[PDB]
């Protein structure tokens, strides 16, 4: 978000790791992977993984 700004950076300051409000780490990883420009197929493949 500093070297390739796409969306606002306020959401990361609202949702911080020091607030203990990350009840769902999976959502944080999905939100971080959604910012990627990786092709959709690859995203589906990432969802296919079980571990």
């Amino acid at each position: 978000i500093a070297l390739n700004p796409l969306y606002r950076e306020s959401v990361l300051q609202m949702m911080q790791a020091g607030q203990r409000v990350v009840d769902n780490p999976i959502y944080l990883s999905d939100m971080g992977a959604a910012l990627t420009g990786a092709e959709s197929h690859e995203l589906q493949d990432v969802l296919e993984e079980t571990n």
Binding site: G18, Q19, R20, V21
Partner: peptide, 30 residues
């Protein structure tokens, strides 16, 4: 003799200026 403040996930390291943003408004009265 005042009630404890609601730190609410905010560490204040010794000799380190820090900022606190509690969500409650009952602390604004105190």
């Amino acid at each position: 003799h005042l009630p404890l403040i609601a730190i609410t996930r905010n560490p204040v390291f010794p000799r380190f200026i820090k900022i606190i943003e509690v969500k409650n408004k009952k602390l604004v009265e105190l």
